[PDB]
């Protein structure tokens, strides 16, 4: 372990690198809001690091070779099957949503660690504070049950409460007809199978639940469809902001050091994600878990720790 | 290389390895010297000379 | 021994029977703790002053100061309850049973 | 139960008279068992951190074995000194007071009566 | 017993004064006041700084009582040990004051 | 009658039933500190008078 | 949680305990006790949640009542003796008050009512500290007062503590309450033997300290607080399941493990003084302890409980926690039996 | 081992954090003359 | 309540029924009072009347257990002309178990209480005869 309390004793203070440009900015929107490139523009305007949307193989990408692991080893859920049958028997919907929330939590932990260590601000898309707007859009469409909803609420309550919200959020306002037309012109062979009621529900939860609390707990900006293209207006608006809200104001060196200690233990971040609540859409019995665990242990680069694999070509294993 | 990020345990910590080797050698020679001194004092005390 | 000694013992037993079977909030418990404080202080001072042990006059004052700081700690604990439940009642202390 | 013995020289792990005993050899079976315990501790430390058990941390395993064998040697020395004190005090108090320890006349079997209970 | 005589006389004079101030004007037949503060209906806020400075006063007074017996102690034979002890105790008071300064104690009630 | 019911009833099941019953009686506290301190008072009074542990 | 402040607080706890150990005056014993509890109060307020405040309030009230009883015993001893050496007391009331004061301090039943609650509401490091290091000082106090200890009172407290701890641990499913009741039962077990041979008491204290430290280290390493997550841990590291299985086997005194070392030898000092029914009764209650231990290992490793889906991400990250002294304390808690006469160093 | 008395004991929260379950307002009287409605935070 | 045990054991077995009966009744009453006091302290009573009802129920039940056990042991020791026999205490313990089962409105509980109380009284006689010491003074 490199960073510890000994470093903080020796003078590794995290507000030494906390300049005025170290800002946590997340951008939101609809299914095909076109924000995906816009944040990239911010990555070439304020110099901030940008992170893509947390996919299924994001945890596969961050460690090991970074290659996409097969869906049996990680996820066991596919977006194409969700677009095919949302009310399926095996419960692809809630399993996919729980896996994506876990991946987004891992992405937010990595983003917070990078911001706290390197001192450089970070731009994200659809952070963990804007994921339930998907799940509620499932429940109002009947895609899941009530037990899944309260289990997700318990998971969010035990996971979010140890973290701080981002500095500025940006929501791109794209209506339902524009979203459906953009999906039609995009050309994905499986993306038209969702009803427009799902996009309407996403927009309704966005403008009914997300904005009334992100107008209070953090800084909020709102833009229409065409105003998202004008990058200079957006960066001038975010660079001329007066931060008075949010708990980022009352952060001393001790609290940020504790946060840095907590986000550098990836087991500690995801310890409360998979609580022992037995909901038949996410629990898997002993036989399949044992089989897939023994198969994952046979994968190259994963049988031992990252510095102790002979089959991938690590030398001086006997002197460590 | 195989791992995209460099692992913290990728390279052997040579300072810690040398410290472990030196500590083992020092403790071994200290134990041997202590045993030799104690057995010499024992044979001088009880006259098994 | 002397009758004042037995009066101090009876006072300490009164503070003991008041400290255990309370009905009110934690302030009553801390007040009975201060009763124990005062009884022990008076008994130690009477013993030291009656037997002419000159050095053990260090005993009474010290016998206050340490636990006095401990008493201050108890006050902070009550403030924590006053920052959590509004009132410092002992009937609100039923969250750890389950 | 030796509260009156070590009180003359308190906080002494190994006193001077402990040097009068034969010290235990470096090939003591208990000492080798403690070295085996150190090797097992090294194996457990390699196993719990997801490392190759029989290859990784050879210097770590040697340090574990060396530290365990050192503390085992010193603890064995203290144990031998304590039991030497115990039976020396036993023999000394037996020698000093032979009125409470009479010499029993060990009678032969030619006249002592043993009751016999037949089995059938 | 003269000290207790003075205390009893003084307490009884105070009792006489409060009896004159409380029961002597009751002879008059002026009126009965039915009488049907900024505090409307809210609970009393727990301003934590007052409690903090009160317990800080308590700790400082306790070790002031520790610091007390120097005028009697100044006639002792071992003056060097006394000087070291007194200087180190006042240094402990300075260190506790410095800590109470640093950890946001003397802010918003300076 | 015997090797599946009565022999199962005499030694192990009566013991297990008594164990679980008195365990449920022991761990059925309400978490109130006042009751604990009242039980402390009763214990102290019993030890001082009804047992005479200080002779 | 300033590291300088945490280091200073831990040094204050160590200084208070060692002041209880090395002093020759009753006032310094009480000084060490007071400074120890005063500096251990912030350890149980590490996480800043109301349950910790509840637990620390109950702990402070019980420890302060015990300390006031301790001064009652000291002042009575001063009245009847006129001297302050830490040795046998000179009054039966002093011995009685001191005995239940130390029983209140150590969580001995029926004064145990704070132990399963407080340990439920504090973080696992604070629980380890309270169940491991706090028990050391009043053991020294009880060891230095053994000529004047009344036999009936300490025997009644011991048997009541063992029985109550076993029967209370028979029902709880939380790990911390099971640990608390196990600590109560072990406390009664090693206070039953004190008046006959205190070397057995010191040996059982060291063995219990090592074994409880191993258990708490494993619980902080697996980040598990209840039975269900401890069941779920078998997807993450099966070697940790094997380790918790073998040290829970050792925890119930099953040979050839280390936990069979003290209690059996405690029986070796029961029949010397012509007592036969007592080790049998405490052995039956140790069997109750082994029953809920066996329940814990059945839930943990000897079966394969159904897991969730997110374990896969937990299979992509090794344990980054500072697993300190886990292998040494695991080996010393399982394979120490052929080195039984090492207890001679505790004389 | 659930009984009637302990049938209402919920499982504890997984993070072991209790849920958390304002400001002063003053009405200064008119006793120039001014009536101030005053909001305080200490 | 230590000298009460001595007064119970001062009367020889199977000689005078009355004083053994009152000694066993007082022992049972004391035990029931301790159990009732601990039950009231730990389990909060609904009111004063229900609390003293539970206290009286426990006290009278335990006093009846003691009186029945002592009376039955004494009449069995008289009818066997053998004070030094554990059979009399076994019969008295079974009578106490039967009375406890009748009080608790049960019969299997009564039979189990017969067996266990008879074995316990037999072991009490065993300790009285052979000098078993469960609270042994430190000898070595
Ligand atoms: N409930 C959901 N249904 C479909 N896609 C989702 C859901 N939640 C998150 N996503 C992700 O969000 C992406 C859409 O964002 P984008 O197409 O980048 O604007 C999808 O391709 C998924 O990776």
Curated annotation (Swiss-Prot), chain C:
It is an enzyme of class 7 (translocase). It catalyses: a ubiquinone + NADH + 5 H(+)(in) = a ubiquinol + NAD(+) + 4 H(+)(out). It is found in: Mitochondrion inner membrane. GO terms for biological process: ATP synthesis coupled electron transport. The chain crosses the membrane at residues 1-21, 29-49, 61-81. Its EC number is 7.1.1.2. Keywords: Electron transport, Membrane, Mitochondrion, Mitochondrion inner membrane, NAD, Respiratory chain, Translocase, Transmembrane, Transmembrane helix, Transport, Ubiquinone. One of its GO terms (cellular component) is respiratory chain complex I. Its main location: mitochondrion. Gene3D superfamilies: 1.10.287.3510. One of its GO terms (molecular function) is NADH dehydrogenase (ubiquinone) activity. Coiled coil: none annotated. Pfam families: Oxidored_q2. InterPro entries: NADH_UbQ_OxRdtase_chain4L/K (IPR001133), NUOK/Mnh_C1-like (IPR039428). It is a multi-pass membrane protein. Core subunit of respiratory chain NADH dehydrogenase (Complex I) which is composed of 45 different subunits. Core subunit of the mitochondrial membrane respiratory chain NADH dehydrogenase (Complex I) which catalyzes electron transfer from NADH through the respiratory chain, using ubiquinone as an electron acceptor. Part of the enzyme membrane arm which is embedded in the lipid bilayer and involved in proton translocation. Belongs to the complex I subunit 4L family. This is NADH-ubiquinone oxidoreductase chain 4L. The lineage of its organism: Eukaryota, Metazoa, Chordata, Craniata, Vertebrata. The gene is MT-ND4L.
From Swiss-Prot, chain E:
It catalyses: a ubiquinone + NADH + 5 H(+)(in) = a ubiquinol + NAD(+) + 4 H(+)(out). Keywords: Electron transport, Membrane, Mitochondrion, Mitochondrion inner membrane, NAD, Respiratory chain, Translocase, Transmembrane, Transmembrane helix, Transport, Ubiquinone. GO terms for biological process: mitochondrial electron transport, NADH to ubiquinone. Gene3D superfamilies: NADH:ubiquinone/plastoquinone oxidoreductase, chain 3 (1.20.58.1610). GO terms for cellular component: mitochondrial inner membrane; respiratory chain complex I. Its EC number is 7.1.1.2. It is a multi-pass membrane protein. The chain crosses the membrane at residues 3-23, 50-70, 79-99. Core subunit of respiratory chain NADH dehydrogenase (Complex I) which is composed of 45 different subunits. Interacts with TMEM186. Interacts with TMEM242. Core subunit of the mitochondrial membrane respiratory chain NADH dehydrogenase (Complex I) which catalyzes electron transfer from NADH through the respiratory chain, using ubiquinone as an electron acceptor. Essential for the catalytic activity of complex I. PANTHER family: NADH-UBIQUINONE OXIDOREDUCTASE CHAIN 3 (PTHR11058:SF9). Belongs to the complex I subunit 3 family. This is NADH-ubiquinone oxidoreductase chain 3.
Curated annotation (Swiss-Prot), chain F:
Core subunit of respiratory chain NADH dehydrogenase (Complex I) which is composed of 45 different subunits. Signal peptide: none annotated. It is found in: Mitochondrion inner membrane. It comes from the Eukaryota. It comes from Ovis aries. Belongs to the complex I subunit 5 family. Disulfide bonds: none annotated. The gene is MT-ND5. The chain crosses the membrane at residues 31-51. This is NADH-ubiquinone oxidoreductase chain 5. Core subunit of the mitochondrial membrane respiratory chain NADH dehydrogenase (Complex I) which catalyzes electron transfer from NADH through the respiratory chain, using ubiquinone as an electron acceptor. Essential for the catalytic activity and assembly of complex I.
Curated annotation (Swiss-Prot), chain G:
Keywords: Electron transport, Membrane, Mitochondrion, Mitochondrion inner membrane, NAD, Respiratory chain, Translocase, Transmembrane, Transmembrane helix, Transport, Ubiquinone. Belongs to the complex I subunit 2 family. Its EC number is 7.1.1.2. It catalyses: a ubiquinone + NADH + 5 H(+)(in) = a ubiquinol + NAD(+) + 4 H(+)(out). One of its GO terms (biological process) is mitochondrial respiratory chain complex I assembly. GO terms for cellular component: mitochondrial inner membrane; respiratory chain complex I. It is a multi-pass membrane protein. It is an enzyme of class 7 (translocase). Pfam families: NADH_dehy_S2_C, Proton_antipo_M. It is found in: Mitochondrion inner membrane. One of its GO terms (molecular function) is NADH dehydrogenase (ubiquinone) activity. The chain crosses the membrane at residues 3-23, 25-45, 67-87, 96-116, 122-142, 145-165, 178-198, 200-220, 237-257, 274-294, 325-345. This is NADH-ubiquinone oxidoreductase chain 2. Core subunit of respiratory chain NADH dehydrogenase (Complex I) which is composed of 45 different subunits. Interacts with TMEM242. The gene is MT-ND2. Its main location: mitochondrion. The keyword NAD applies. Core subunit of the mitochondrial membrane respiratory chain NADH dehydrogenase (Complex I) which catalyzes electron transfer from NADH through the respiratory chain, using ubiquinone as an electron acceptor. Essential for the catalytic activity and assembly of complex I.
